Every structure is written in C-alpha cells, then in structure tokens.
C-alpha cells in the first residue's frame with residue numbers, strides 16, 4: 001500500500017507496463033465560505049495552508065500593532081494634557097480632565 | 103478582421119476567445135490543443151555499441167623466437183611469451199621443450215550487433231515547434247495540423263490561423279542527448295576520443311557505417327596456462343552493456359512539466375510550459391450584422407447551484423427575450439469563470455442553461471450573450487471528491503478572490519481597528535493643538 005502526495009499541478013503515476021495514471025487535487029474542504037469566521041479560516045487554511053497562515057499571521061500582527069499605536073498615542077496625549085496641571089503650585093484638575101484622562 | 107489572443111500551453115483543455123467586431127454579431131471560438139511537439143535539431147557526435155575482441159589464432163614458433171609488428175588497429179596489443187610448451191590432443195605441439203615462443207595478438211572492433219544495438223550521442227540545439235489544434239468555428243469542429251513557429255497559417259473554413267512562436271524556449275532536452283531506442287537520456291557523454299574503459303563511450307564511432315573506431319578498453323594480454331594454446335587477456339567489459347543495465351529512468355519518465363518523450367524523430371510532446379499566442383484572420387463574409395442576428399433583452403441571471411470543482415459543476419439559468427430565432431454566442435466576462443457552451447440556440451421568451459467552472463468561493467461574474475450582458479452571483483460549495491483524473495477547466499485564484507462574507511468580516515475588523523486608530527489620532531491632534539495654542 002503506497003500513499004502518494006498530489007501537488008496542485010498534478011501527479012503522474014506509472015505502474016509497470018500500463019499507461020500512466022494522472023491525478024489532480026480538488027478544492028475540497030471541511031470548513032466553508034459563507035459561514036462563521038472560524039469556518040472561513042478553516043476553509044482557506046485547508047485550501048492554501050501556507051498562504052493563509054502567512055496572511056492571517058501578518059494581518060493579525062499588523063492589526064495588533066495598530067492597536068498598540070492607538071494606545072501609545074492615547075498615552076502620549078494623556079501626558080501632554082495632564083502635565084501643565086501637575087506643575088501648577090495650586091493645581092486643581094477640572095472634573096472632565098480628571099475623569100477622562102487622570 | 104485580425105484577432106490576436108493568447109492561450110496557456112496546455113493539452114486537452116479548451117479555451118474560448120471572443121472575436122468582437124462592433125456592428126457585427128460577436129463570435130466565440132473554442133480552441134483546444136490536442137498535441138504540442140518540440141523537435142530539437144540534432145547533430146550526431148558519435149555512436150556507441152558493444153565491442154568484440156578479435157584474437158587471431160596464436161602463432162607458435164617452435165625452436166625459435168617470434169617477433170610482432172605494430173598495427174593501427176583501434177586498440178592493438180601484441181606480446182611474445184617465451185618458454186611455452188603447449189599440448190594438442192595427440193601430444194606436445196612441437197619438438198623443442200623450452201626453446202619455444204608464442205605470439206599473442208588482439209584488437210578491438212565494433213561487433214556485428216552495432217548495426218542494431220547502439221546508442222547515439224547527439225548535440226541538441228533549438229527546437230522546431232508544431233501543434234495539432236482543434237477549433238470550433240461557427241459550430242463546426244475542424245482539426246488543423248500546423249507548425250507553431252509563427253510562420254505557418256492554416257486555413258479553417260476560410261479563416262487563417264497562425265500559431266506561435268511559443269513564449270517559452272524551455273526544452274526537456276539538454277545540450278548533450280543520448281538515444282538508445284525509444285529512450286532518450288540527458289547524459290553528459292565524453293568527447294569523441296576521450297572515452298574511458300568500462301564506461302559509456304569506451305568504444306566510439308562517428309557513424310554506424312564508419313570503419314574509424316576509437317577504443318579504450320585496457321586490453322592486456324596475459325601469459326597462457328602451461329600446456330595450452332589459449333590466449334588469456336584482461337579487458338574492461340563493454341561500457342555499453344554496463345550502461346544498458348545502469349541506464350536508470352529515461353526522460354519519458356523523469357522530464358518536468360509532464361513532457362512525453364519519443365524517438366525517430368526525437369520529440370518532446372505536450373509540455374505544460376508557458377503559453378502560445380494565436381493570430382486569427384477572419385474574412386468579412388463570416389460576420390453577420392447585428393441587425394440580422396438575434397438580439398436579447400430583458401435578461402436576468404439566476405444560479406440554482408454552484409460547486410467549485412475542476413469540472414463544470416456550476417449551472418446558471420438566464421431568462422431572455424429574443425427578437426428572432428437563431429444561434430447566439432456566449433462569453434464569460436471574467437477569467438475566473440469558464441463557460442462550457444460557446445453558443446446557444448434561442449427564441450421567443452424563454453430561458454437558457456449554461457454550465458461553468460470556477461475556483462471562486464463566491465461566484466460573481468458577468469455573461470455576454472449576443473452583446474447583451476447579465477450579472478450572475480452565487481455562493482459556491484466545495485466538492486467532496488479529493489482527486490480527479492482531469493485538469494481544472496478554470497484558472498487559479500488571486501489573493502483578492504475571496505468570498506463575500508470573508509470580505510465583509512475583513513472590512514468589519516479592518517474598520518474596527520482603523521476606527522480606534524482614527525479616534526486616538528484625533529485625540530492626540532486635539533491635545534497637541536491645545537498644547538500649541540497655549541504658551
């Protein structure tokens with residue numbers, strides 16, 4: 001019993017003196033498009049196991065990075081709007097600033 | 103009207119091209135390559151075959167010393183052995199006991215079998231391309247055999263088809279080709295006159311009929327056993343016989359791109375490499391004015407089923423109102439979707455059925471029938487079968503070719519993060535503006 005892997009371009013198999021057999025893969029999946037997010041990833045993962053992982057890994061990395069940037073900008077804005085108050089000898093912080101930033 | 107299109111260099115897969123000549127009803131031509139052949143120019147360097155070692159009856163000089171002469175024979179050696187006392191069935195060969203010499207000589211020459219059993223060492227250069235093309239022209243199946251060098255026009259019902267040149271110069275054959283029978287090998291054979299014993303090329307000849315033979319067999323004459331007249335020798339066994347056992351797989355089985363290899367002449371067939379341009383010259387007589395042709399209006403497309411399988415698993419039903427009875431061309435407006443039918447028969451107020459193949463998870467495409475376009479859309483499902491015995495009738499997908507719901511999820515997630523960034527950016531800009539406003 002021999003298990004042969006079939007490339008997307010197809011596989012040719014010759015058995016003895018018989019004419020060669022040719023095989024091509026189908027785009028079969030257990031996941032599905034038009035389903036839940038995890039079913040969609042499974043669909044594309046099964047069809048394109050390396051392209052899908054690279055796209056998902058990179059997209060996830062970038063999206064998380066952009067969130068980190070949004071937070072970093074918020075913290076920068078926070079320090080800039082608060083500092084001028086903390087340096088005041090009789091500093092009093094407006095409620096909205098106290099609630100929103102502090 | 104000159105129409106220029108390009109089809110992938112594949113065999114057994116039909117491609118459809120639209121001939122669009124404004125003012126006239128559109129034509130769709132279905133072209134299928136049945137065979138593509140690359141025939142390399144060959145220059146014979148030499149041939150090899152099994153050699154035979156020729157050993158003339160030994161000369162036994164009794165009561166004296168023999169001497170030998172040099173000869174020009176392909177691989178010649180002579181040696182005189184002293185102290186020989188050979189016996190025949192009836193007793194000792196001659197009168198003297200120890201004062202005897204034997205002259206042994208031998209040479210290598212091509213065996214009689216070299217006329218049938220030989221390998222040819224060729225230098226391969228460029229290849230002439232030719233192909234057999236099936237064309238569906240105005241509903242008829244015409245098969246044309248033509249050269250694919252771009253220099254041959256073959257007529258199909260008064261239309262001229264020029265095929266090639268092929269976009270890829272790739273060939274399965276290397277510069278050095280060795281051919282035995284039906285088997286071709288990419289072997290780096292030694293230069294003529296540079297052969298080695300026990301290896302391919304140990305015996306070489308420029309042509310099958312040539313008497314000019316090069317040989318390097320390391321033929322060494324040995325001293326005969328006492329009391330005998332035989333001539334022993336040590337020689338490297340034919341490299342041809344060794345090669346035949348050690349040939350390994352031929353290009354027919356090892357070549358890239360599924361190339362089929364044949365000999366007499368040497369040919370590479372059906373290589374799935376690159377693509378092949380086709381130029382079609384269609385006479386004005388072959389065109390029907392749009393006013394004479396059937397015209398469709400009030401068209402609407404519905405797709406009751408879709409499977410993105412290699413075969414034509416998709417079906418679409420299109421409603422139409424035909425101005426008159428007649429045949430009508432059908433064309434896909436997207437490369438992602440292949441339609442099986444080139445033409446349909448339509449009349450009155452009815453619906454037409456077409457089959458299609460796509461790799462798309464979500465099939466979004468337009469179909470042009472008698473210059474009238476419709477928009478089709480479907481959710482396609484995967485096949486349960488994992489393997490088929492035929493190539494896909496559809497093209498591959500790009501990175502942008504994703505399902506509708508996948509695109510929606512991407513937009514929701516991308517927009518969600520983009521919104522958070524846009525808000526954070528706005529807050530920072532506002533704070534900085536306030537910081538700049540203050541002194």
Ligand SMILES: *[C@@H]1O[C@H](CO[C@@H]2O[C@@H](C)[C@@H](O)[C@@H](O)[C@@H]2O)[C@@H](O[C@@H]2O[C@H](CO)[C@@H](O[C@@H]3O[C@H](CO)[C@@H](O)[C@H](O)[C@@H]3O)[C@H](O)[C@H]2NC(C)=O)[C@H](O)[C@H]1NC(C)=O
Nearest residue numbers: 114115116132134136236237238239240241242243244442
């Ligand atoms: C133009 O030619 C195509 C392709 O067929 C070619 O011409 C034929 C006359 C033969 O010489 C073929 O060897 C050659 O490739 C025609 O399309 C083909 O039609 C045949 C039926 O005539 C289809 O075979 C059927 O397939 C089904 C499903 O497997 C079986 O159940 C049937 O029993 C039968 O075998 C064949 O699949 C089909 N091929 C394609 C790609 O569609 C085309 O009809 C013909 N047109 C005209 C006007 O002649």
Ligand SMILES: *[C@@H]1O[C@H](CO)[C@@H](O[C@@H]2O[C@H](CO)[C@@H](O[C@H]3O[C@H](CO)[C@@H](O)[C@H](O)[C@@H]3O)[C@H](O)[C@H]2NC(C)=O)[C@H](O)[C@H]1NC(C)=O
Nearest residue numbers: 026027028029030031042043045046047484485486487488
């Ligand atoms: C979708 O899920 C299917 C199972 O729910 C799966 O089919 C099964 O796949 C396994 C390998 O992962 C096959 O091999 C197993 O079973 C055989 C006996 O049938 C054993 O000899 C093996 O050692 C192993 O345990 C199953 O045979 C196969 N069963 C069926 C009914 O197909 C599909 O492959 C999944 N599809 C995709 C695209 O992943």
